[PDB]
Design an enzyme around this catalytic site. Structure first.
Site, PDB file in Angstrom:
ATOM      1  N   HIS A  29       0.818  -1.189   0.000  1.00 18.63           N
ATOM      2  CA  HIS A  29       0.000   0.000   0.000  1.00 18.63           C
ATOM      3  C   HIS A  29       0.846   1.229   0.000  1.00 18.63           C
ATOM      4  CE1 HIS A  29      -2.637  -3.201   1.692  1.00 18.63           C
ATOM      5  NE2 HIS A  29      -3.662  -2.498   1.233  1.00 18.63           N
ATOM      6  N   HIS A 267      -3.893   3.092  -3.643  1.00 20.72           N
ATOM      7  CA  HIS A 267      -4.195   2.709  -2.254  1.00 20.72           C
ATOM      8  C   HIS A 267      -3.502   1.369  -1.872  1.00 20.72           C
ATOM      9  CE1 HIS A 267      -6.377   1.224   1.273  1.00 20.72           C
ATOM     10  NE2 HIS A 267      -6.827   0.219   0.545  1.00 20.72           N
ATOM     11  N   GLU A 415     -18.674  -1.697  24.183  1.00 19.37           N
ATOM     12  CA  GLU A 415     -17.874  -2.911  24.403  1.00 19.37           C
ATOM     13  C   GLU A 415     -16.624  -2.985  23.538  1.00 19.37           C
ATOM     14  OE1 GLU A 415     -21.133  -3.018  23.516  1.00 19.37           O
ATOM     15  OE2 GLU A 415     -22.137  -3.684  25.362  1.00 19.37           O
ATOM     16  N   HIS A 478     -29.748 -12.639  24.745  1.00 21.30           N
ATOM     17  CA  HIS A 478     -28.761 -12.408  25.796  1.00 21.30           C
ATOM     18  C   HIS A 478     -28.049 -13.670  26.256  1.00 21.30           C
ATOM     19  CE1 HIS A 478     -30.683  -8.540  25.802  1.00 21.30           C
ATOM     20  NE2 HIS A 478     -29.921  -8.107  26.795  1.00 21.30           N
TER      21      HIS A 478
END
Lengths: 670, 669
Positions: A29, A267, A415, A478
């Site tokens: 890259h 890129h 999280e 859950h």
């Protein structure tokens, strides 16, 4: 110190080292390193405080490349400035087997790379953690009447991909909330990655979102040639003390390339021979493949003496601090050495069968409060509500703007960032031991950061409550089912599921000892007994025998259990014993550690000629065949759960003593 | 018409139905339902277009509760307005076994609940996908000279938790970029919304962030009593046609509770008997447990008649459209029926061994282009990857503002939101078959949305390239190891790893057939041969036999492989046969489908008395003991990978023909 033409020459050396490396590897890259070379020049030659001959200098500024695909940028800087991990021979082995120049930057390979990046967004979050560590230690140790012993900045380069990932918004929301004024993010605003230009998915006002998050924003309209403005931008970031700063630096991707600058093609593919020729011409660069002019080295290699002096000056500061504050210095030295304190393990309590059973989420709270006084580096918190998690350290307050010495971190409902920020805290390499906590099910939000803990050898402790259908009524959104299997399969991640008090102590003992490997601990909502012969030491073995009907006599059947289900195995054994069977019960708290035991030990637990085997665990049977074989049977749950009280769920799904007995009988027929 | 007083009564009826239900279950979250009750009154009684006796009414407004812990809010509304899935007896069975009122809302349980929520942030993303579906179908089918046949709004209620989750920033960035003017998000701005945490963890300027993302933002400072202002906010949101609207509604969590309103306690625990009597007092509510006043039912049950009228009017509009555009109507009806077109499967090409091998990521491109003309509902795209990936449909252009009829979606680097958006697209229940794509390794970013596909019975096709160390130089940050195992373990998710062209067609045949279960397809970077006896049909069996040394004769050793490694098993078989062994080669493209076969079928492939077994796959051994046993061996990689060219990685990690041969000899003992 230096002329504009010699800066320019230095900038182009960074460019062509990247270009020639990527041509040789035929992989990589080049466009980002070509656009960012001016930033690299300023950062490495003028701004950052570091010692290239000592990548572990405690008080160095930290640099993170969040845009990890641009790895040839960082390796070019490190080579130029004299890091011994990236000599020229290593530039010429970019992306090759056993090189110190892997395709993405890896802290576990290359001394001087701080963290592992590549997965977009992780780096900026790790940078937030590195800044938290600096702020925390500075608050805990610096004294107003002497020079600071902790004082360094955290620099991060990120791009449009990082800005699109939600993890970055999470972490940058927290960094703004915490007022982390020594975090300085340099945004490569080059309008690209892999699907054309960015007008195709990404037209948001990134500067306005960052203002909204509590950041100071500065705009460098010309990051291709405005070195004075880059210096000015960085000084203005340092003068803003109470907010993290985003420097939005507009660059042309592949700057220098006449034909492929500002294209998607530059890129993620080498420029190739023709365009490289044209780029040498276009940038007036007569130097050959990998050839950096000597005058460019004499500039960048000035980092050697400059870094040696910085480090010597910091030692001076520390000598003067020690003179006035010997006790505090002794504590600072002991922490930042990363050595674990003498006797910390004895902090962990012990349990007897007579002690009334508690949920392992409660045992875990006990362990956190037992350890925090013994481990000055223990720091962490929750994405939850520590009412519904039980993970606060009673000896400390909440980490916030103006109370950075406090040890309890409140991440909010973030999280994924929480994990990656914890990686940064550990990888500061200053002895901080980060733990973080949520419902086990929400590990799915944070899975890449958790994998980065394992890949980067960051000893994050993941403290995960509500491990199963035992949580009950919240239902199958859950309730974990596949999660234990998913982490057992993950390389270099311990997945510990303690049954009772001793095994919970045991789980934490392993987690703390593993500074270079993360540990996930799965914890129950529901109470469980303290089962005889469960122990601290048994956890370390991964699987261990807790019952044999008759000492010295080979079992007829082996029942293996974990966590909340171990009690189903022990009860089933009593039943089978009364029919005259010889039963062995094995607790299986950590598969990974059982596989690290000797062949002899593994055979002593699971004799190869006893194929009558049952496992029981309120989770999928997936993976269990490793231990139960073709002829064995699992008692668990392989479907999603349901919304009902936990005792109902255990019965309806057949996770019961009677099913363990039935299964044991079935396996005895084979 | 209705008085302010009668409105208040109706709002309180919502509050107490929720409170009384949560007290009985001794489990649940009353605070948000108490704070949002006014929004519920407005949305259900005045604003939303729906038929409570037909939850499948095509042109209904869609409602999504992103803040899924507040499930009693939605169940209260559904019961009050006359949905037959939520009779009073189901209100009284909140969170109980086999009720239609699970703790979080579940589309697979309760007719009228559109998607599965609970995991914070998923709902707003799914709402983006429902809005995309509506915008797309409208652009494809509406004609400028007759009444529209597609015209509905997508409403979402979300809270601080959803706003903190990264996924929501991703999806709201896309919704802004796409100008989704019929998406209206009501943000319950009840600070103390927990976690986190009051003025702890979350002090950002949410309204400013949303402006940055391209949204219109409206502030309702008093969502407790300003019904007129809520009505006005919604009208203003509809008048903004070219941007999604965020209505920031300031409420008191637990509004009505004299002692626990505005507390963390009221978020996630029942009020209890004492505080409920206090609340009854404080709100001047004399009525008993679960007792909705008749005059409140007569208001809310007006949705029955209004809903029947709305649906009749839509049928009228459809008859008039059909009169003038009978071809276009026939297409619309066939799509929106959700029935798959007869013979779509014939579109998939066939391969033979002399056809030069290609990478399965290239085969997958072939399949997408073969299916797109046969499947008018195929829609999808990639997370910043269609050059490395190869996932564009050549018959359509790019979905954007001003070109909603186009079928290729560009998600940018937003894997998690891509998956949840796709859930919404599927669960619009209008026939759209969403696929999405990225490098397999980045499934870890999007894992909860994927799990929601499986739980919610959404037929999303996950097209995942660069499945292994075969990707080479990017190194161990990008190389899957545990991923196949992690999806094999996931309930109700098919994890297919095709070997060659025929199995790739067969993976897609399975994926499209499965409109109520997601399919993940792992695809190689590197080329592989078309192996003899590999087939479309074999994929449907999950595991199948592709080679036996001798017809009729029991193998001495069984070699099993997947994907790019199946060739190592076939080559190793030939070497072992030349020594004198009888070998069986089994392709294992889908473990889940194999386990759905009969015991006799399974035994036909893996005879129980043959324990000399080797598996080969560029992935962990974890899980494989289910088929290789204690005596078998795996040839694979259980560590992280490395940054080097792929051929080098295969050799260094021991994933070679010679290692399969040696492993087979070891298992023969």
């Amino acid at each position: 110190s230096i002329s504009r033409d010699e800066v320019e020459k230095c900038i182009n050396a960074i460019r062509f080292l990247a270009i020639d490396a990527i041509n040789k590897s035929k992989s990589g890259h080049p466009g980002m390193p070509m656009g960012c070379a001016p930033m690299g020049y300023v950062l490495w030659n003028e701004v950052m405080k570091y010692n290239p001959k000592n990548p572990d200098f405690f008080n160095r500024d930290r640099f993170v490349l969040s845009a990890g695909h641009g790895s040839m940028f960082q390796y070019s800087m490190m080579h130029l400035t004299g890091y011994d991990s990236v000599p020229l021979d290593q530039i010429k082995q970019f992306r090759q087997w056993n090189s110190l120049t892997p395709g993405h930057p890896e802290n576990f390979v290359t001394p001087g790379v701080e963290v592992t990046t590549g997965p977009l967004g992780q780096g900026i979050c790790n940078a937030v953690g590195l800044a938290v560590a600096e702020a925390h230690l500075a608050a805990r140790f610096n004294k107003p009447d002497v020079k600071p012993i902790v004082d360094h900045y955290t620099y991060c380069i990120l791009g449009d991909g990082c800005m699109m990932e939600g993890i970055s918004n999470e972490a940058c929301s927290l960094a703004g909330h915490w007022g982390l004024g020594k975090l300085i993010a340099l945004y490569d605003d080059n309008k690209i990655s892999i699907d054309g230009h960015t007008d195709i998915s990404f037209t948001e006002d990134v500067a306005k979102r960052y203002e909204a998050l509590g950041w100071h924003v500065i705009h460098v309209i010309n990051g291709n040639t405005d070195v004075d403005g880059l210096r000015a931008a960085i000084a203005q970031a340092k003068a803003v003390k109470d907010k993290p700063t985003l420097i939005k630096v507009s660059t042309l991707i592949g700057y220098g390339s006449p034909n492929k600058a500002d294209s998607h093609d530059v890129h993620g593919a080498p420029l190739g021979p023709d365009e490289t020729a044209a780029t040498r011409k276009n940038l007036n660069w007569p130097y050959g493949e990998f050839e950096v002019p000597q005058d460019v080295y004499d500039v960048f290699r000035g980092a050697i003496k400059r870094g040696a002096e910085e480090e010597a000056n910091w030692h001076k500061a520390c000598a003067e601090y020690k003179a006035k504050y010997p006790k505090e210095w002794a504590e600072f030295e002991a922490l930042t050495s990363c050595k674990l304190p003498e006797n910390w393990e004895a902090a962990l309590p012990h349990f007897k069968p007579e002690d009334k059973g508690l949920a392992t989420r409660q045992h875990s709270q006990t362990m956190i409060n037992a350890l925090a006084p013994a481990l000055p580096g223990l720091i962490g918190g929750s994405a939850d509500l520590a009412p519904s998690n039980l993970t606060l350290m009673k000896i400390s307050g909440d980490f916030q703007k103006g109370s950075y010495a406090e040890r309890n971190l409140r991440f909010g409902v973030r999280e994924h960032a929480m994990g990656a920020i914890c990686n940064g805290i550990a990888l500061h390499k200053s002895g901080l031991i980060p733990y973080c906590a949520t419902f086990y099910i929400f590990t799915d939000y944070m899975r890449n950061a958790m994998r980065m803990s394992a890949l980067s050898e960051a000893g994050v402790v993941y403290v995960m409550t509500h491990d199963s259908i035992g949580l009950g009524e919240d239902g199958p959104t859950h309730q974990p089912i596949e999660h234990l299997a998913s982490f057992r399969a993950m390389p270099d991640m311990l997945m510990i599921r303690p049954a009772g008090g001793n095994e919970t102590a045991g789980a934490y003992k392993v987690a703390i000892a593993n500074r270079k490997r993360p540990t996930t601990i799965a914890l129950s909502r529901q109470n469980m007994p303290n089962i005889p012969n469960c122990s601290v030491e048994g956890v370390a073995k991964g699987a261990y025998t807790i019952h044999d009907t008759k000492a010295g006599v080979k079992p007829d059947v082996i029942l293996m259990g974990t966590g909340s289900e171990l009690e189903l195995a022990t009860a089933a054994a009593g039943i089978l014993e009364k029919e005259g069977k010889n039963v062995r019960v094995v607790s299986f708290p950590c598969w990974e550690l059982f596989e690290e035991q000797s062949a002899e030990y593994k055979e002593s637990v699971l004799p190869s000629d006893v194929t009558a085997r049952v496992s029981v665990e309120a989770a999928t049977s997936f993976g269990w065949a490793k231990y139960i074989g073709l002829k064995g049977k699992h008692v668990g749950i392989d479907t999603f759960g349901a919304s009902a009280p936990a005792p109902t769920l255990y019965e309806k799904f057949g996770i019961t003593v009677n099913h363990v007995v039935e299964a044991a009988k079935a396996t005895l027929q084979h």
